[PDB]
Design a protein around this ligand. Structure first.
Ligand SMILES: *[C@H]1CC(=O)[C@@H](O)[C@@H](O)CCCCc2cc(O)cc(O)c2C(=O)O[C@@H](C)C1
Length: 342
């Protein structure tokens, strides 16, 4: 088998001329030439079978991506693994080779307002499809937004996704968690398990802010710091928004803080389009029940050049509603990947 940086990367003979391109969660990512389709592709190596939770993340993503089909979601082109469960130690997922991601881009490139608008449109167009399937991505952030050379955008990684469950979203103070820290909604730290669609809209709002200035808007240094950053910009929550928090520990924490004023968006972002900031404000709303939903966001004036609901498709087959041991999960991953065998 071909080796990359000392490790086995066993994808041939269809995929040749390998180059290391980065690191996944359970393995490395390489580019490779696809000798059938005569294009280069991205390949992620996954080694999950020793841990029930790794198997869970892997199965979840495979099951979601094999049902989804959307221009702004990166699909699975091929899955490579051994012919038998006994011999299967790794799984390789083959996907379109993109040019870069938004994390890398924002490290050195100023975006024009036209690029910001088109990127945000494509993020929300993909998210409309995801939420229409009753699925939550739960880890939206710049490094999960891939771009090709003509700035078409695709959402990566459904390993933390879940089926939405709003009736079972409530929990205690300081419990959860959901998402990468900088992109976590305030309610995660207060009273939410991250089981409603509003969790993803908060993350998109954080991404929009970061496109406006090339810096994360809420860069908390640790779990606890994240709420300090959010409230330092949004200011103190209103009485009405506090009353919506029935958990006493969470509500009394907020009541214990000195008053903080809101920082105006046009002071934080003085070169931004005013329609962009109006949409930013509606995505970064403290109360998740008042936060804008994905279809309202697509219809916002900032996106008027692109909005077209008949060209913003939804899922045909939403996901209707599982933790069990790794041996059954390995079996389930073997079965879910069978369609790609010769
Ligand atoms: C999508 C998530 C993602 O891109 C980030 O987590 C990366 O840091 C992961 C490693 C690089 C992935 C990559 C790199 C290039 O140049 C082109 C690609 O198409 C990809 C890619 O498809 O990443 C997928 C597998 C994960």
């Amino acid at each position: 088998p071909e080796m990359v940086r000392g490790q086995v990367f066993d994808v041939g003979p269809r995929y040749t001329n390998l180059s290391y391109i980065g690191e996944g969660a359970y393995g490395m990512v390489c580019s490779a030439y696809d000798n059938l389709n005569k294009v280069r592709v991205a390949i992620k190596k996954i080694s999950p079978f020793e841990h029930q939770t790794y198997c869970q993340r892997t199965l979840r993503e495979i099951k979601i991506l094999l049902r989804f089909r959307h221009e702004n979601i990166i699909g699975i082109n091929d899955i490579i693994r051994a012919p038998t469960i006994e011999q299967m130690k790794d799984v390789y997922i083959v996907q379109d080779l993109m040019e870069t991601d938004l994390y890398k881009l924002l490290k050195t490139q100023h975006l024009s307002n036209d690029h910001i608008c088109y990127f945000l449109y494509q993020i929300l167009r993909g998210l409309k499809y995801i939420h229409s399937a009753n699925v939550l991505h739960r880890d939206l952030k710049p490094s999960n937004l891939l771009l090709n050379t003509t700035c078409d955008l695709k959402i990566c990684d459904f390993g933390l996704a879940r089926v939405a469950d709003p009736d079972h979203d409530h929990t205690g103070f300081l419990t959860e968690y959901v998402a990468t820290r900088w992109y976590r909604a305030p309610e995660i730290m207060l009273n939410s398990k991250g089981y409603t669609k509003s969790i993803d809209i908060w993350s998109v709002g954080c991404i929009l802010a970061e496109m406006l200035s090339n810096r994360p808007i809420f860069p908390g240094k640790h779990y606890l710091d994240q709420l300090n950053h959010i409230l330092g910009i949004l200011g103190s929550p209103s009485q009405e928004d506090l009353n919506c928090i029935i958990n006493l520990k969470a509500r009394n924490y907020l009541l214990s803080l000195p008053h903080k004023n809101k920082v105006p968006w046009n002071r934080l972002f003085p070169n931004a389009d005013s329609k962009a900031l109006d949409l930013l404000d509606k995505m970064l709303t403290f109360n998740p029940h008042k936060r804008i939903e994905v279809e309202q966001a697509l219809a916002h004036p900032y996106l008027e050049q692109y909005y077209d609901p008949s060209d913003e498709p939804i899922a045909e087959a939403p996901f209707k509603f599982d933790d069990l041991p790794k041996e059954k999960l390995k079996e389930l991953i073997f079965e879910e990947t069978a369609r790609f065998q010769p």
